[PDB]
Design a binder for this molecule. Structure first.
Ligand code: FES
Ligand SMILES: [Mg+2]
Ligand SMILES: [Mg+2]
Lengths: 131, 105, 92, 46
RNA sequence: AAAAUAGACUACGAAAGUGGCUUUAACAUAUCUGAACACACAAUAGCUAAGACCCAAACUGGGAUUAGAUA
């Protein structure tokens, strides 16, 4: 599910006094009047809060997996409309491959975080075919 | 986001120009826009003859409507401009002020 | 010994010249400025060898001119006669 | 600073209340976006 | 339908390729090598079905020309 359109942008969510503000400025500063990239940023921020131990550390493998997952969701939403977009088809298939690679590395290094990631993002890890 | 509507309206008398401006701004607000400013660039001869709604125009009034609209609004507004008969030409662009100056030093 | 040479960038280098439009905003509605970069008789756009602009501002001017032409702000086959007496910034 | 600037700016927006008055005021005003540049890189106001 | 100027530019794209304007999506990946057999693309021949046909056009007819015509 997407964030509500009334949610404030990530950059305008900790500014002091944002609750003492007129409705019109709230609309101007919401996801209703921004392109899709802020909504994806909000999704990423929510997942980082929900899954990882340190939401601020973005270089960790779990953070990269979450980022690639939101990107993959974006590609699937895009291809649901542009069925003949071969470039974005390539991008989606590749991104799935590297997310599988990151999941393999996380499994081999940190199993607890791997379980948490797989539960939080609804990812079913599958072992590669032998032939 | 923030958009600018450049509007080329038919060379008409003031009451009808006011009516058309009210109608287009009302459409913008109906599609979810917050209109910021309305600026009149003036009435002037067109750079070239423009055929619209089965009528040939050589003069027109130029207006700018700054606004903030939800992204899905733009396409709809375009269709509406395609139906209004008093508009020779309406074009919606991302507002130039949002594009921030590149640091060419 | 203090008299040995020291390592530094060449100080005798003239800082790269800034094009006349550097630091200025190029808008498709500013038909006066955009008419300072077209042929008076044909309306063709001048190149950077004539205008002298850095390639980035050349691209901005090109895109602005096309935007103005298609949005009904600027003539295409000629320069608008009202702007024939503006300062000549082109080397032609 | 951006938020405060919007606090001050949102006051003077065209609402559905002051629509007609602002439309007439726009019809009673002209704005100019044309300026010229010299070989010296100086803006020549119209 | 396909895009004179810019373009004396050499950018984007994995490659083939992309140079009219606006808007919306949007441009994978923090080591490298590793596919005939996995998934995506791409191009090159040659035939098969139907369809359009302005224009051009191998073949096929017609007209004019030396003294085996102009191939
Ligand atoms: S150096 Fe300033 S515009 Fe290029
Ligand atoms: Mg490899
Ligand atoms: Mg034929």
């Amino acid at each position: 599910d997407d964030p509500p359109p009334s949610t404030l942008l990530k950059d305008y969510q900790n500014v002091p006094g944002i609750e003492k503000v007129d409705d019109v400025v709230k609309r101007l500063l919401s996801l209703e009047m921004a392109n899709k990239k802020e909504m994806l940023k909000i999704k990423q921020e929510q997942f980082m809060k929900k899954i990882v131990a340190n939401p601020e550390d973005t270089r960790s493998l779990e953070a990269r997996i979450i980022a690639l997952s939101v990107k993959i969701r974006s590609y699937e939403e895009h291809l649901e409309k542009h069925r003949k977009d071969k470039a974005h088809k390539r991008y989606l298939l590749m991104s799935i491959d590297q997310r599988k690679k990151m999941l393999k590395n996380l499994r081999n290094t940190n199993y607890d975080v791997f379980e948490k990631i797989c539960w939080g993002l609804g990812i079913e890890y599958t072992f590669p075919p032998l032939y | 986001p923030r958009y600018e509507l450049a509007l080329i309206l038919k060379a008409m008398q003031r009451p009808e120009t006011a009516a058309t401006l009210k109608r287009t701004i009302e459409a913008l607000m109906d599609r979810g826009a917050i209109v910021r400013d309305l600026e009149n660039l003036g009435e002037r001869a067109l750079p070239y003859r423009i055929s619209a709604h089965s009528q040939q125009h050589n003069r027109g009034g130029y207006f700018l409507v700054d606004f903030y609209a939800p992204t899905a609004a733009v396409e709809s507004m375009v269709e509406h401009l395609s139906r209004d008969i008093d508009v020779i030409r309406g074009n919606i662009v991302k507002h130039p002020l949002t594009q921030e100056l590149k640091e060419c030093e | 010994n203090e008299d040995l040479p020291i390592s530094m960038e060449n100080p005798y280098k003239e800082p790269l010249k800034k094009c006349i439009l550097c630091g200025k905003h190029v808008d498709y509605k500013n038909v006066q400025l955009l008419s300072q970069f077209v042929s008076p008789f044909t309306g063709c756009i001048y190149g950077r060898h004539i205008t002298g602009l850095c390639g980035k501002k050349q691209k901005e001017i090109t895109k602005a001119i096309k935007r103005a032409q298609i949005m009904g702000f600027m003539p295409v086959t000629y320069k608008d006669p009202a702007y024939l007496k503006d300062p000549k910034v082109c080397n032609i | 600073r951006e938020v405060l600037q919007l606090q001050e700016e949102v006051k003077n927006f065209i609402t559905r209340e002051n629509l007609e008055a602002r439309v007439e005021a726009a019809l009673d005003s002209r704005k100019n976006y044309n300026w010229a540049i010299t070989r010296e890189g100086l803006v020549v106001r119209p």
